[PDB]
Amino acid sequence: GKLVIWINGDKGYNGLAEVGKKFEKDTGIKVTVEHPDKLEEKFPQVAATGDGPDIIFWAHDRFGGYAQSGLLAEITPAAAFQDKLYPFTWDAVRYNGKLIAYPIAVEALSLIYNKDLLPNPPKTWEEIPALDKELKAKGKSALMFNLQEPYFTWPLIAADGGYAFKYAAGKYDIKDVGVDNAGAKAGLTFLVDLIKNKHMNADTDYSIAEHAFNHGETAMTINGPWAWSNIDTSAVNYGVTVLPTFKGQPSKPFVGVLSAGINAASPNKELAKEFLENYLLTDEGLEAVNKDKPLGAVALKSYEEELVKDPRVAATMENAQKGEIMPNIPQMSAFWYAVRTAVINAASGRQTVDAALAAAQTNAAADWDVYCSQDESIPAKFISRLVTSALEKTEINCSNGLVPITQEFGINMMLIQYTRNEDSPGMCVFWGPYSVPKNDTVVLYTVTARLKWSPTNLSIQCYMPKS
């Protein structure tokens, strides 16, 4: 007789907790809002265990994956309620014909700039270097944004034609991935050049960028609505405008739709539906959550019509319309990880843009996931994906030999030993140790695998500290 909700920390969870307080008051059912770290990865683990929240708040891109594991309850809202929200929202949360969650809002990255430092922000990425040299002479910096998450660097990568998945035959095609093409190479290459010229640092993350911009150290940042609140608390007067173009083309951010899924194991499903439908989604509730932190353009029409008046929301919908809606298919979980690697390594010099993006193309389509330990004593772990509906025989290439893995069904696991021979029971051990360019601290252990269908190859790699 209680509702536990999971939502990210950057989103306002305080307002949502106030909504939960309203609900508790009326019906007497307590509502607790929590914000675990890396909740999108932690949710499947515990949901398969039978634990976890009744409701989970995340962008729709992950939800398909959850729905593939039977972790999400099916949504059956009334036709009136469906009419209360825009249709494209619902369409984003539709997976295999069924509604797996409730759309709460639309998110797209935008360019937030300091008007006092930069009254006229640039309309192109190519001007960022020239600006930087100027601002660095005054003790400031042109642009700082999170390079650790690919969500923030994707607009530049996709502007020139880089794309996550190609849509063909009524579905997103997994065998066609656009991370390795000329457009992505041009965008990420431009980023790496910006890092090599010291216009940006490869270690900058979300909190570093927020601290730099909100305190007036940098003139510009790239962020979404959730950040604006903090900037309103600072002394920085900020505009929100279109992202800079790249090679004369508009930056294409991946557009998320904040959605609330219902845990399939929850006994409270009726109460979660009551709370979300008749409490959370209203002018009042969305207004509260918006007060704590902005949601961007909400899916609820009545309140949206009032939010569009906000020029920041209008800009959010401009960048959103220039971008694309993220697919919700499970493979996204792989994509975001793969790209997350390519940007980081390429930014750290660990890999060339070409190698990083090729490995990212092979990884973005994932029949396998690797868990790299931080200690050489414990082996790495290899967990295959489900592959509901191909997957004939996959041959792994290991130091001690090759390990075949054939078909079967469901989930398949294999332990990849770090470099020790233990005696020889058909086991796989890593390659290496191998050198890591520009870094003497970390060494690299790799493995390759060749997948047969009814002729592709992936490369798994684990970086580890030396001492």
Ligand X SMILES: OC[C@H]1O[C@H](O[C@H]2[C@H](O)[C@@H](O)[C@@H](O)O[C@@H]2CO)[C@H](O)[C@@H](O)[C@@H]1O
Ligand Y SMILES: *[C@@H]1O[C@H](CO)[C@@H](O)[C@H](O)[C@H]1NC(C)=O
> Which lies closer to ligand Y via its Cβ, residue 388 or residue 409?
409
In whole angstroms, the minimum distance from the beta carbon of 137 to ligand Y comes to 26
Residue 84 contact among ligand Y, ligand X, a copy of itself, none, beta carbon within 5 to 8 Å by kind? none
Query: Could you give the CA distance from residue 400 to residue 424 in angstroms, rounded to a whole number?
Result: 9
Question: Is residue 62 involved in binding ligand X (CB under 6 A)?
Answer: yes
- Interacting residues with ligand X between 329 and 358 (CB under 6 A): 336
In whole angstroms, the minimum distance from the beta carbon of 381 to ligand X comes to 16
Question: Is residue 467 involved in binding a copy of itself (CB under 8 A)?
Answer: no
Residue 107 contact among ligand Y, ligand X, a copy of itself, none, beta carbon within 5 to 8 Å by kind? ligand X
Question: Is residue 41 involved in binding ligand Y (CB under 6 A)?
Answer: no
Query: Could you give the CA distance from residue 99 to residue 423 in angstroms, rounded to a whole number?
Result: 51
63 Cβ partners below 8 Å, 6+ apart? 72, 93, 95, 100, 101, 259, 261, 328
Contacts of the segment 399-405: beta carbons below 8 A, 24+ positions apart: 399/429, 399/430, 399/431, 400/424, 400/427, 400/428, 400/429, 403/427, 403/428
Residue 8 contact among ligand X, ligand Y, a copy of itself, none, beta carbon within 5 to 8 Å by kind? ligand X
Residue 148 contact among a copy of itself, ligand Y, ligand X, none, beta carbon within 5 to 8 Å by kind? ligand Y
Query: Could you give the CA distance from residue 441 to residue 347 in angstroms, rounded to a whole number?
Result: 17
Question: Is residue 130 involved in binding a copy of itself (CB under 8 A)?
Answer: no
Place of tokens 């390079």: 147
What secondary structure letter does DSSP report for 282? S
228 Cβ partners below 8 Å, 6+ apart? 112, 238, 240, 293, 294, 312
Question: Is residue 279 involved in binding ligand Y (CB under 6 A)?
Answer: no
> Which lies closer to ligand Y via its Cβ, residue 148 or residue 263?
148
In whole angstroms, the minimum distance from the beta carbon of 349 to ligand Y comes to 7
Question: Is residue 32 involved in binding ligand Y (CB under 6 A)?
Answer: no
Range in contact with a copy of itself (rule: CB under 8 A) among 11-19, 80-88, 358-366, 375-383: 375-383
Question: Is residue 294 involved in binding ligand X (CB under 6 A)?
Answer: no
Residue 10 contact among a copy of itself, ligand Y, ligand X, none, beta carbon within 5 to 8 Å by kind? ligand X
How far is residue 465 from each of residues 85, 201, 203, 369, measured CA to CA in Å? Answer: 50, 22, 17, 21
3-state secondary structure of 448: strand
> Which lies closer to a copy of itself via its Cβ, residue 251 or residue 259?
259
Around 117, how many Cα atoms within 13 Å sit in the side-chain half-sphere?
A: 30
